[PDB]
């Protein structure tokens with residue numbers, strides 16, 4: 001699948017708002033993932049001791065990780081589909097070291113959409129949400145193809 005330039009622009013125009021405060025958006029997204037799908041937290045040896053939303057909010061280390069995650073995703077989105085070089089290292093680490101199934105990438109995609117929908121109704125109406133969903137679907141499809149090449153069922 002291939003996004004139109006107009007779809008990419010809807011993606012990039014909400015991402016511009018995320019970038020006013022990537023750390024706060026990152027916290028909201030990972031906390032939403034862990035609350036909606038608690039089994040995902042068990043993939044993180046670094047964070048799985050955290051018991052409550054309050055502890056997650058107070059973790060400086062989690063905040064930092066969420067900045068790394070959203071900046072990596074932002075760099076992918078800014079390539080507007082030309083993201084082979086960015087996906088190689090990410091797919092390798094997430095297949096072989098972290099062992100993240102495609103279903104869990106679906107769950108984080110849901111969390112991203114939920115937070116953007118809550119925080120950004122001015123830039124995240126129906127057409128914009130559709131564009132973001134298409135971008136995240138493209139990302140997951142390309143990662144799933146890389147996962148297979150790398151030897152991981154996903």
Ligand code: HEM
Nearest residue numbers: 040043044046068069072073089090093098100104105108
């Ligand atoms: C939008 C999707 C995602 C992006 C962009 C992303 C990005 C990253 C980045 C940039 C790193 C650090 C470098 C590396 O190891 O590759 C990382 C680490 C990691 N990711 Fe992801 N990630 C995503 C989804 C997920 C999901 C859904 C899980 C678990 C359910 C996960 C689990 C991990 C783990 C366990 C680490 C290592 C954390 C640590 O011990 O330092 N990732 N991720």
